[PDB]
Design a protein around this motif. Structure first.
Motif, mmCIF file in Angstrom:
data_model
loop_
_atom_site.group_PDB
_atom_site.id
_atom_site.type_symbol
_atom_site.label_atom_id
_atom_site.label_comp_id
_atom_site.label_asym_id
_atom_site.label_seq_id
_atom_site.Cartn_x
_atom_site.Cartn_y
_atom_site.Cartn_z
ATOM 1 N N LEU A 1 0.828 -1.199 0.000
ATOM 2 C CA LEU A 1 0.000 0.000 0.000
ATOM 3 C C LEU A 1 0.877 1.271 0.000
ATOM 4 C CD1 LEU A 1 -2.943 -1.277 2.118
ATOM 5 C CD2 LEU A 1 -3.174 0.317 0.201
ATOM 6 N N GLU A 2 0.311 2.387 -0.429
ATOM 7 C CA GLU A 2 0.982 3.662 -0.202
ATOM 8 C C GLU A 2 1.248 3.896 1.303
ATOM 9 O OE1 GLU A 2 0.205 8.482 -0.431
ATOM 10 O OE2 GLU A 2 -1.170 7.113 -1.514
ATOM 11 N N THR A 3 2.380 4.527 1.632
ATOM 12 C CA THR A 3 2.622 4.968 3.008
ATOM 13 C C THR A 3 1.868 6.275 3.245
ATOM 14 O OG1 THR A 3 4.579 6.172 2.224
ATOM 15 C CG2 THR A 3 4.902 3.942 3.046
ATOM 16 N N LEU A 4 1.207 6.405 4.413
ATOM 17 C CA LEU A 4 0.483 7.619 4.758
ATOM 18 C C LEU A 4 1.188 8.269 5.943
ATOM 19 C CD1 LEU A 4 -3.303 6.551 4.296
ATOM 20 C CD2 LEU A 4 -1.675 7.624 2.679
ATOM 21 N N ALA A 5 1.733 9.440 5.693
ATOM 22 C CA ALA A 5 2.451 10.171 6.724
ATOM 23 C C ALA A 5 1.492 11.130 7.389
ATOM 24 C CB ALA A 5 3.618 10.923 6.082
ATOM 25 N N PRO A 6 1.784 11.470 8.624
ATOM 26 C CA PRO A 6 1.016 12.540 9.265
ATOM 27 C C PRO A 6 0.918 13.920 8.397
ATOM 28 C CG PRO A 6 2.401 11.623 10.927
ATOM 29 C CD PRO A 6 2.938 11.258 9.565
ATOM 30 N N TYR A 7 -0.170 14.660 8.591
ATOM 31 C CA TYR A 7 -0.318 15.879 7.827
ATOM 32 C C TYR A 7 -1.110 16.821 8.704
ATOM 33 C CZ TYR A 7 -4.936 14.124 6.501
ATOM 34 O OH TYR A 7 -6.198 13.535 6.439
#
Lengths: 151, 97, 17, 105
Positions: free
Chosen positions: C1-7
């Motif tokens: 999966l894509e990595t999801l970083a904090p935002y």
């Protein structure tokens, strides 16, 4: 592979960073390879909503000096999930530094590194001054602390 | 309740709570203990190379440390004037605190 | 999966904490 | 609220703390425990102003703003010599050296 790394949970978790220190704070996110990544800084007395994720690891530092700060009275913050809709608070505070470390902070704040060894002080303190706080030093210590009480 | 006496190189006498003074590892090591020499009570330490303007600041650090360690209260900065910083660093390093 | 970083949310406002 | 003090006389400095709502006279009881002189033989000052034994420390100006653990308030102490009270006398601490050149902006 590094133990201190975020996991890619992809499970949203809302956090509120609350700076209850007198320092300008740098939030540091440990990414999925365990490398630190900076986020925008937080002035003293300021709070801010952040969209984070379950199992993501955070540290907080003085943005200018990289001194370590506490978050909810410990060094690492890892959110779980929002309980019944409520934001997770990360309350950032000043540690009680040893007097020696606080003195090192103040001298480093007044003297260029190139001039540390021109100071007329006990010579062991030169390396102490040069041993600046930094995230990777703390990550090493925290990792071996973790494995030590793990056994 | 129990107090100890810390004497500066210039002869000033500082009277501080014993619990607070045990913040320093060096002082703790030079004072009698419950295990070590409780009968032979040692209540006084002399500091031949720490002057009174530094030792007073050290005592203020003991008070700060005991007050704010393991506490719910919000923690303020320990302030250090530039003019005292180097001597205070030498004293902190010597005193292990 | 894509990595999801904090935002940080675009509608977010700093506040006194 | 606790208040944090330095009680000074000659070259003696007592570091001690007390409640903001406690009284000046109770502070004399502390000093008596330490230096073995009765409240009768004690005069306590803020700067050159003698403190009223019946008043609280907070009333007299010792508060979270002025009597911090890291920056305690000074209280002056004078004893009774013979049947008469000595003049309040507090010996100065030593002085730091000039600030080194590499420590100025």
């Amino acid at each position: 592979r590094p133990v201190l790394r975020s996991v890619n949970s992809r499970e949203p978790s809302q956090v509120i960073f609350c700076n209850r220190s007198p320092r300008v704070v740098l939030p540091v996110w440990l990414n999925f390879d365990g490398e630190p990544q900076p986020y925008p800084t937080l002035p003293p007395g300021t709070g801010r909503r952040i969209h984070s994720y379950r199992g993501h690891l955070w540290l907080f530092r003085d943005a200018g000096t990289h001194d370590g700060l506490l978050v909810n009275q410990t060094e690492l913050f890892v959110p779980s999930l929002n309980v019944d809709g409520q934001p997770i608070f990360a309350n950032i505070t000043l540690p009680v530094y040893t007097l020696k470390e606080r003195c090192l902070q103040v001298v480093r704040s007044l003297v260029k590194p190139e001039n540390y060894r021109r100071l007329d002080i006990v010579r062991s303190l030169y390396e102490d001054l040069e041993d600046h706080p930094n995230v990777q030093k703390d990550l090493e210590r925290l990792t071996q602390e973790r494995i030590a009480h793990q056994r | 309740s129990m107090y100890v006496k810390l004497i500066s190189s210039d002869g000033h006498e500082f009277i501080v709570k014993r619990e607070h003074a045990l913040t320093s590892g060096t002082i703790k090591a030079m004072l009698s203990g419950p295990g070590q020499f409780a009968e032979n009570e040692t209540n006084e330490v002399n500091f031949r190379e720490i002057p009174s303007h530094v030792l007073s600041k050290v005592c203020m650090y003991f008070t700060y440390k005991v007050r704010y360690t393991n506490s719910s209260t919000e923690i303020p900065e320990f302030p250090i004037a530039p003019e005292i910083a180097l001597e205070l660093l030498m004293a902190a390093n010597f005193l292990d605190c | 999966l894509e990595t999801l970083a904090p935002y940080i949310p675009m509608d977010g406002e700093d506040f006194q904490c | 609220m606790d208040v944090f003090l330095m009680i000074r006389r000659h070259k003696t400095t007592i570091f001690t703390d007390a409640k903001e709502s406690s009284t000046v006279f109770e502070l004399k009881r502390i000093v008596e425990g330490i230096l073995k002189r009765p409240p009768d033989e004690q005069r306590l000052y803020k700067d050159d102003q003698l403190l009223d034994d019946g008043k609280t420390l907070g009333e007299c100006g010792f508060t979270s703003q002025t009597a911090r653990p890291q920056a305690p308030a000074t209280v002056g102490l004078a004893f009774r010599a013979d049947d008469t009270f000595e003049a309040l006398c507090i010996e100065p601490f030593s002085s730091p050296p000039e600030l080194p050149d590499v420590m100025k902006p």
